[PDB]
Subunit: 279 residues, 5 copies
Amino acid sequence: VTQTLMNTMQESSDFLTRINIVPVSEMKGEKIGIGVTGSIASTTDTAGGTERQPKDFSKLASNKYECDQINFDFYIRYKTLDLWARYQDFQLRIRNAIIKRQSLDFIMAGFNGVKRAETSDRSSNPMLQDVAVGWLQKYRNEAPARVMSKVTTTSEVIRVGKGGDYASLDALVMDATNNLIEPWYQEDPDLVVIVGRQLLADKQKRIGNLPAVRVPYFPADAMLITKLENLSIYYMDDSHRRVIEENPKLDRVENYESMNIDYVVEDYAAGCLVEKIKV
Amino acid sequence: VTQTLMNTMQESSDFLTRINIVPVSEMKGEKIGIGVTGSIASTTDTAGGTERQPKDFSKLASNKYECDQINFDFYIRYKTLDLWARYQDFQLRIRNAIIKRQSLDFIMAGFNGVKRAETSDRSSNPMLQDVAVGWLQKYRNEAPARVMSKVTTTSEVIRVGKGGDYASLDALVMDATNNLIEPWYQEDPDLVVIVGRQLLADKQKRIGNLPAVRVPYFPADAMLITKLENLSIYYMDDSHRRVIEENPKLDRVENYESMNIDYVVEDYAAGCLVEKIKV
Amino acid sequence: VTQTLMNTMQESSDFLTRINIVPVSEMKGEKIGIGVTGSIASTTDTAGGTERQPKDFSKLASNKYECDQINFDFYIRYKTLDLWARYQDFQLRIRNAIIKRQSLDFIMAGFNGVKRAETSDRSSNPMLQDVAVGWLQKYRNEAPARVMSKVTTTSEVIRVGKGGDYASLDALVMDATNNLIEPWYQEDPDLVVIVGRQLLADKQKRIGNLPAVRVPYFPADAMLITKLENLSIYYMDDSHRRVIEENPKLDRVENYESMNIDYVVEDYAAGCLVEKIKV
Amino acid sequence: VTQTLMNTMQESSDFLTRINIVPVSEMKGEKIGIGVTGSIASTTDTAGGTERQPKDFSKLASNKYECDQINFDFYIRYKTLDLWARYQDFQLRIRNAIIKRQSLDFIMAGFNGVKRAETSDRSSNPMLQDVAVGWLQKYRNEAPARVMSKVTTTSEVIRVGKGGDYASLDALVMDATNNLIEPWYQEDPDLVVIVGRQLLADKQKRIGNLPAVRVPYFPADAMLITKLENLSIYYMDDSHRRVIEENPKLDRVENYESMNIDYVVEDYAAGCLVEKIKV
Amino acid sequence: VTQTLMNTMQESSDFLTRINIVPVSEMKGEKIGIGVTGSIASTTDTAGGTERQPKDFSKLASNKYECDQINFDFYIRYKTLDLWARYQDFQLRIRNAIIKRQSLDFIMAGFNGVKRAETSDRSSNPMLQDVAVGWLQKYRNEAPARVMSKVTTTSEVIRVGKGGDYASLDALVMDATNNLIEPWYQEDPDLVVIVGRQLLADKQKRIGNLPAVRVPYFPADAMLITKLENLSIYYMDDSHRRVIEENPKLDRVENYESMNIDYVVEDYAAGCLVEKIKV
């Protein structure tokens, strides 16, 4: 029944609708392959000679993905609760607000998360980093290739200024696409560049030869290019557990809720990122 | 039943639809928190160690809002009334006109209101100022910070001319956003700039990195930046009282109507304003 | 029942839909004030002190409008009629044509009419001038002020050429707006400039402020600025009279029709016109 | 019943939908007047004096239009017929194709047709010229005025090059409109310029002050300006005769079909053309 | 019943919807003519003289098309199958994915296929070439004319650089259209240019005088111009044979499927291509 809530959350936010979310009933295994393209068409002599052998479309290679839990937990005083109850039919109003906050927090944790560690903190981490391992960290860790942090081997700051390595940013994206992406991945019909809020320069008209799209939260001075169906998140089906209760202590009612999730990029050779950009 | 009329008025005008209006049944208390965002997601060892404590989303800090009444009151002669009655089914026509006028007057009183005082006047105040305390005055009074009236400490005229402090206005909005707004408020997905009619320069295409929108009435040489859901108005539920009657004196029929309202900005750290702009 | 036909005629053409037309049952009196906006909100001590006095919204001042009749009259030969009677449902094919022509004639007579006089001529007046008094003539006659036609007192040819008084047109628009319109009328959600065809300069076409719009027929070298709901036409309800003849005269079936109308601007403070523009 | 087929054909193509087609039951007579505009409104003393006389809207002047027949006739082999029959429900497919071809051929014959002559040929006339008299030839023949083939009286090549008479083409269209069109035809609300494919220069954005539209086939170095309701075609109602039959000779099935049509421009003073343009 | 699946596949992808697919029940014969235009209208004396002879619209000239089979064949492990089955109603999900892959692979094989040969390979041919003969190869083989690989007779590299033959690409497309296309094919109302991904230069706004459209896979440094209804593919009706089965060997379930298809361009004189472009 958790799939109903998960699909509701996915529909609630636009960005998540462009991404896929699948429930896996086990804990640690191998991942489904969606963003794979190939030339499955062929022909061969089937009369007096060789025989035809098929070709997979799964591309399983070193995933060993494992899922961990995260929990959202909050509380409300009684005065605020009564003020909300004064609203006409606030039952839907509260639900929509909490759903929207959870959906936004998913992405905020996803894009710039790194180094999952117990006993998370919200003092030194305004943006939540140590809550789970993210897509960017997944690239930066599992495949140390296909990332441009250095230049070739001088200072590892890819600059675009006066003495810039790539004075024009479209030339940079062209070089990245032509160098660190597979040939039959070059001309894919739905490749998209993800960039933050500072590097926009006000123009989703076009960039290089690929459409652009921004996200709510994203590390500045960092860019990515991939299909908007490659990356995804997995959530264990029968692990969503919530409980609400009030306590006369400090006159509040609180709720706790926990799910088991893990971010995962399906294909590695489709999509590269760059970091440490100046200007 | 007043909520029906209030929602009708809100729907009648487009701008008010983008804003929220909630009925509070008490007079003076604490305010609901809507425009609040945070990283409620976390993780911590729940087996053999610490325990998890939730986190509020209310952010109550020094509101002490109090509501006052305002009343609209007018009259019509008999000749104009009969001429209106000559129209085919004018009953809806009159109602729509008065609703539109009330809705527009709400905003006109809201944006540039200051220093609520009894015995309002319409001679020295073409625009109504002393009718109620407005959002701009609320910022300028409750939080003396997050407002740029001076320069740093030379003349307090933020100029954009030849010897201008900010020759380019987009640089000004960038500086304001980066300086007087909270970090996790910087990249919010629905931040909007409010500007009057003179500072438009003909271009809602784009400004800086934020979309722009104008309002019917607004103080010239003044600009604001915030979410279009932060600010709001509160109206006491059981306080709307109206009465109509005719008097043979000077051959007229008049009506009086009074409501209890108060403008309120939900979050202060989300949204800053600037005043006294030259060119 | 004439109101049904009048409403059909109004709905037929687009420009007339943006304008208001009303049946008046009397002949000469005071006008209905639709397009006016005043701050009706206020507040005053009603306990131990003064009392609250309402505020009208009519602002009637020296209106004194008087209606006059105009009549249409035409005829068709039997040959053209028999040819028309060939289509499937020729009735609508004729009705829509005559309705559209009558509406176009209404607009033409409205915009550049002057000095109503009996025994109208169609030789010396290609465009119909002496048929009725138009909005432009109404401004030029009733309010001799609030019309910009001279320079200050040299030649009254407002030029925008090389040595022009206002080499840039939008500067002239801003000057006229800020010098001839009321303060609380300087900004309004629908203030629009009307201009002819030759003065368009190819750029509806977004202009600096007051988004422009053209009309079918309009005097060149003249411009107006007002709300598209300010001006209007009034028609006497029970005065529409038509009659048909099929005469054994030379060869024809003719028809005559007559209505009683009068053009009227609702408020003079909202809207100014400029004439005799060079270049 | 032919009107059903004619309306089907008119709806099939977009361009013909913007034009009118009327069935006339006689052969040679006078033409219906649609694209006529005038000031039918007037006023005159009907009490003690003159009487009011109506005004026609037919404008009959020297039409004497006469209709001639044209016939389409083709054939298909049996192999192609069976291959078509292999398609799923090809009965509609064949009909749509032949309707589209007939509709396109109507226009192709219309725009650049001249000098109707029996025994048409398809060797020396790739584009069909001698099939019927066209709109362009109708202007060039019936009204020798309102056409600019010469300059005033030097070489009759209206050039736009270096030593061009009209270096700017919009100036040319402005001059043509102001010179060879009637005054009350100048500002008509639906005037349109027709131009071929070579003179487009890639920009229906705007040209001069009139919208532009291209047609499938059109003589290069030729331009026209008129209302898209002035010109039209007439077709005799009870003259459409078709017959299909197969003949074992050369293994084919053929069909012949004949209609009686004639192109006609309604008003001459509304719309002028220019020819022999260089660059 | 195969037509249901074929139409489903055609609808699944947008590009194939703009193209036609017809089932032929024989193996090798003559092709249907769709993209043919002509002046079928004519006129001739049918009384006392010659007789009228119709004109074909088939244009059969040297097609001799022959169809060959291609087969798609793949397999899935059991773990991936169970993971897919965990999804809610994956039966449609798998079908949509395989349909999309087949549809894309059709085009990828079509545009840059050459020299059909048995025992296809996927090592030295990342893009599949020897699977079937494609449209480009069809032009380059059957009609050695209407292709610009050389210059006139210097180096056969049509360059656009500094010393370029055609410095401007629109001039190149204009020259190609005016030279290697038939006159009555020049002004066709739906001519379109096909270009790859590198030669886009970011601008489907417009190119030359024709609209542009890109395709997923296309040979770089190659361009084509034709109607989007000229080319097509033929598929034998009763030849689609598929079979699925599992084998405990290496724990997999596989499927094989074979169809009989052949690409074919309907008209040769409508549409030309150019290859070997520099810059």
